From a paper:
The membrane-anchored [name] (soluble N-ethylmaleimide-sensitive factor acceptor protein receptor) proteins provide the energy to drive membrane fusion in various cellular contexts, such as intracellular trafficking and exocytosis. Supercomplexes of [name], α-[name], and either a syntaxin tetramer or one of two binary complexes of syntaxin—[name] reveal atomic details of [name] processing and show how sequential ATP hydrolysis drives disassembly. [name] comprises three structured domains connected by flexible linkers—the adapter N-domain followed by the D1 and D2 AAA+ domains. Six [name] protomers come together to form the active form of the enzyme, a homo-hexamer.
To gain insight into the structural nature of binary complex formation and disassembly by [name], we prepared a complex of [name], ɑ-[name], and the binary t-[name] complex (21bin20S) composed of full-length soluble [name] and soluble [name] (1–267) in the absence of divalent cation (i.e., non-hydrolyzing conditions) and performed single-particle cryo-EM. First, models of the [name] D1 and D2 domains with substrate bound in the D1 pore were built into two high-resolution (2.88 Å, 2.92 Å) classes from a single dataset, differing only in the state of F protomer engagement with substrate. Next, the dataset from which they were derived was combined with two additional datasets to enable the 3D reconstruction of weakly populated states with ordered density for the ɑ-[name]—[name] spire. Classes with evidence of [name] D1 domains engaging ordered ɑ-[name]—[name] sub-complexes were carried forward; eight 21bin20S models were built into reconstructions ranging from 3.39–4.01 Å in resolution, differing mainly in the orientation of N domains and a sub-complex of three ɑ-[name] molecules and four [name] motifs relative to the D1 ATPase ring. All classes revealed substrate-bound [name] without Mg2+ needed for ATP hydrolysis and disassembly, and share the same overall architecture, with a spire composed of [name] N-domains and the ɑ-[name]—[name] subcomplex on top, the [name] D1 ring in the middle tier, and the [name] D2 ring forming the bottom tier. As such, the stoichiometry of the syntaxin—[name] complex observed is 2:1, the dominant species in solution. Three ɑ-[name] molecules bind the 2:1 binary [name] complex; a flexible linker between [name] SN1 and SN2 blocks access by a fourth. Of the eight 21bin20S classes with the 2:1 binary [name] complex from the dataset collected under non-hydrolyzing conditions, six engage syntaxin and two engage [name] within the pore of the D1 ring. Docking the 2:1 binary complex structure back into the seven individual 21bin20S reconstructions reveals an apparent preference for syntaxin, with six of eight reconstructions featuring the N-terminus of syntaxin H3 bound within the pore of the D1 ring. Taken together, we observe that the [name] D1 ring can bind to at least two different SNAREs, syntaxin, and [name], in various configurations.
Numbering used by the authors:
A (entry chain B): 1 to 153
B (entry chain K): 0 to 23, 36 to 286
C (entry chain G): 188 to 259
D (entry chain H): 41 to 82, 130 to 204
E (entry chain L): 197 to 259
F (entry chain J): 0 to 24, 38 to 288
G (entry chain I): 148 to 286
The structure:
């Protein structure tokens, strides 16, 4: 609860990298738990935990979008403290997000149903931490998009 | 070369005469003539036997009621053995140091400690023992507030620790010395070198925290930016962040073009770049 | 031309650093002169003390020689 | 000028140090003799004409003088540095002599005190 | 030509800086030593003065 | 290490021997106490050595000795330097009193400097440090050691300007600059002192600073050529009109051309505080 | 004091004493004594590597003192001084006095004033040197 030292690790599975969930080992924590990762006195990032057997104990695995947003480094030392969301105040009502393709090789002009986009975003990221300005990768119609959180309500 | 034979003959004759006189109040004259015989043998350039005779005369003086003369003879015998069996010099200088500390003479005791450490590390291969001697001398100088000698001992032990892969001790010593220099009105400019050395020690441990270390060095001492050491450090950081061989090679060539790098610095840089 | 004057400014960029280095050396020289002067005055004081000591030692030696000559 | 003054002061200090060492040696010899008698009683270019360069000639002369001055100061600094090491060695030698002389007088005083009782 | 003169000047400045730091450390050490020797010689002269005064007064009293 | 325990045991035994010897009742007790305190110091237990040294000094003084007792008291103060500054300070004051009694100006000045250093580094006090520095400067001026006295006076003036009113700092800086003007080697640094004086005058009032800088220019012709005089003139002109932006621009330019001592920045900021 | 120091075999102080004596004497408009003392100090310091470079200043002072005698021998004196110490040519003093003599040869005070102003601007002058320069100007 007070916070424990941890070593940043590589994301174990690409599917969880797409899910943009903080992947940890079974012994470190339990799947679905919410944590705050302290990288410096001024750098605290709220993540959602998703345990996997392949993660070595004592290490916290991060995906590339997470490292980009938080400026993490493979093998970097951090602190992790368990936290519980205040659903009475912190429940998200609306999410206005800006989306920019991560890959420029396969940029397309195909139309996308934004309703299905929102539905899949909620389904994949239900009960997960999101903050203004956060960056992640979202898979829709098997296409990767770079989502940058703009406004929350 | 008849001179060496003549000096040997004269020294052995004087030693034999001293033995005859002592064999025949008598202790003082015996010790004096034995010291003269040891000096003559030393001039004869037979280093091992000259040192043996000098140490025997020193022990005979110890038999007499005298301390300062005994300690002087012991240190001279240690110097004579310097060019002979190092163990005998080590024992004689250890006994001299014990006597000196018995009388409270810190300066000569610490000088003898440094001398024995130096002879052990230059001639023999066991440098770790010399590390203990250097640390003892540094502690004695700190007790005596001898800033120069203590700083020299700390720098030497930190350098040997860095050479022996004791990165943390070297980095701590360098940081402490640099902070002490900066606090004083003078020597603050040399602090840059200590920071650079300390940063190398840290960088060899890892590359991720090298950014934190360089940030600390920059913000703590903003003027450190003007030093080309910080420029080389950031260049090395950006070079090693990616698996590109040309970057660090051209960086080291550019830095070496100005001034030659020392052996320790060159080997440390090559080690860090390779791994 | 724009490129030529950009190059001329780039060349001038090193003049400031050289000037700072030379002023650093000048300050070092000024400090060293002060330390040398202090050492000089202290050495002169020590030499004066040594002259007094040797004069007194010579007087004491003369007195001891007189005493031993008369008593003996 | 600061360099030159430093050099001359160092010269004077060295001579004074030699004087004091001689004095200490005389002290030691005389005191030893007195003690014994008492006991017995019982190719390149700095210019670049690219676009006339009328404001670059004077800089060259200043740079030339500075380079020459620094070259001379290099040797000058080496010469001034050479003396200090020898002075320090002499200082160490007088350290030893003074300690020995002090111990001798102390032991003589102790012997003088102990002879009566 | 510019590179050669610039690098020569930089090497000369570095050498001068190094030797000046060396003599600065040496001068600080020598100043400490001379500060020590002043006190040491003062104590020695005081002690010898005391001893010789005792000797003179004792010999005068005894004779 | 066994060294510490052995030295501690030897010190205890020697203390017991000296206590027994004095209880029976004399120099043997003093020598035993001194040796025990030396072993204590060897053991690295800086505490409790000062008590033994003080006892030895008192026993030695019991037979009218003053020199050996004074040296032992100085050594005890040095031992207490980090163990307990309160006792080190008391021992140093006692040594100063004894040396003044025997008329040793140089030793008294050295002890006055050491006490000021300890006060400024270990304890929290500047007024006491200023007084001790001034006393040492006076003693060394009496001993014709003008360099150290001037250094101490300059340090005192800097402390006063940093914390106290500037009249003493102004006077000291002006006197030091005038003295340096005659000194050939150090005449150049008088510019910096006059620069500090002008900057300090800036704090007192604008017109006063203008008059002071004009007087300095008149007295020292090359002060007109100096960059510091031009900067002070330009800064006074800008502050006369209540223009903070030009003040900041000039400060930044001056810092860029040459670095700062880390105190000139503080004085510049303090001056700018009242610009409004 | 200098005689006593010489009798005590204590060197390195008689030279400075004589230098100061000559500097003081030149104030009272007595040149022969100043010239003799300055040349003696210069020849004594020429062979000493430490003071050899500084000997140039002494020669310049002697030349300045000898300048007031007469220009005819002053040029010869400068030439003689240059002859014995060819490295003296490296010092800017030689060219300085050459330009001053060139200006004085036709009473051209403007050139001499410009040279003195430039020399002062580049480096500060001593009070004695300034006094001698003004006295030469009065000629």
């Amino acid at each position: 609860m007070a916070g424990r030292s941890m070593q940043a690790a590589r994301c174990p599975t690409d599917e969880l990298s797409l899910s943009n969930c903080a992947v940890v080992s079974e012994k470190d924590y339990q799947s679905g738990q919410h944590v705050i990762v302290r990288t410096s006195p001024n750098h605290k990032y709220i993540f959602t935990l998703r345990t996997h057997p392949s993660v070595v104990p004592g290490s916290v695995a991060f995906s590339l979008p997470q490292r980009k947003w938080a400026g993490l480094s493979i093998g970097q030392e951090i602190e992790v403290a368990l936290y519980s969301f205040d659903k009475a105040k912190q429940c998200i009502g609306t999410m206005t997000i800006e989306i920019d393709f991560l890959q420029k090789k396969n940029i397309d002009s195909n139309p996308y149903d934004t309703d299905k986009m929102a539905a899949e975003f909620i389904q994949q990221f239900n009960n997960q931490a999101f903050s203004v300005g956060q960056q992640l990768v979202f898979s829709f119609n098997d296409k990767l998009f770079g989502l940058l959180v703009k406004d929350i309500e | 070369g008849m001179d060496t034979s003549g000096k040997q003959a004269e020294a052995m004759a004087l030693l034999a005469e001293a033995e005859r006189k002592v064999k025949n109040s008598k202790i003082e004259e015996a010790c004096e003539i034995y010291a003269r015989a040891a000096n003559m043998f030393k001039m004869a350039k037979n280093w091992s036997a000259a040192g043996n005779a000098f140490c025997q005369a020193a022990q005979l003086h110890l038999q007499l009621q005298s301390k300062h003369d005994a300690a002087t003879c012991f240190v001279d015998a240690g110097n004579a053995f310097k060019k002979a069996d190092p163990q005998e010099a080590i024992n004689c200088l250890m006994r001299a140091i014990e006597i000196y500390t018995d009388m409270g003479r810190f300066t000569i005791a610490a000088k003898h400690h440094i001398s024995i450490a130096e002879i052990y590390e230059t001639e023999l291969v066991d440098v770790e023992k010399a590390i203990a001697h250097y640390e003892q001398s540094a502690d004695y100088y700190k007790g005596e507030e001898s800033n120069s000698s203590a700083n020299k001992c700390l720098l030497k032990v930190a350098g040997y620790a860095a050479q022996l892969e004791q990165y943390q001790k070297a980095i701590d010593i360098y940081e402490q010395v640099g902070t002490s220099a900066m606090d004083s009105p003078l020597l603050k400019y040399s602090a840059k070198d200590y920071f650079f050395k300390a940063a190398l020690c840290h960088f060899c441990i890892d590359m991720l925290n090298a950014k934190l270390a360089v940030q600390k060095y920059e913000e703590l001492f903003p003027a450190f930016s003007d030093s080309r050491e910080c420029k080389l450090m950031k260049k090395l950081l950006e070079a090693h962040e990616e698996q590109n061989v040309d970057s660090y090679t051209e960086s080291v060539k550019e830095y070496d073009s100005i001034s030659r790098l020392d052996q320790w610095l060159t080997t440390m840089l090559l080690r860090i770049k390779k791994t | 031309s724009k490129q030529a004057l950009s190059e001329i400014e780039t060349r001038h960029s090193e003049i400031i650093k050289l000037e700072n280095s030379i002023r650093e050396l000048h300050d070092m020289f000024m400090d060293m002169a002060m330390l040398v002067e202090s050492q000089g005055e202290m050495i002169d004081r020590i030499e004066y003390n040594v002259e007094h000591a040797v004069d007194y030692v010579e007087r004491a030696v003369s007195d001891t020689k007189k005493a031993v000559k008369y008593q003996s | 000028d600061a360099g030159i003054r430093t050099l001359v002061m160092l010269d004077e200090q060295g001579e004074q140090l030699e004087r004091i060492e001689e004095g200490m040696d005389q002290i030691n010899k005389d005191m030893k003799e007195a003690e014994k008698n008492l006991t017995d009683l019982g190719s390149g270019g700095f210019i670049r004409r690219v676009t006339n360069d009328a404001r670059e000639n004077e800089m060259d002369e200043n740079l030339e003088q500075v380079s020459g001055i620094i070259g001379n100061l290099r040797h000058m600094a080496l010469d001034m540095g050479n003396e200090i090491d020898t002075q320090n060695r002499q200082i160490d030698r007088i350290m030893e002599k003074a300690d020995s002389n002090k111990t001798r007088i102390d032991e003589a005083n102790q012997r003088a005190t102990k002879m009566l009782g």
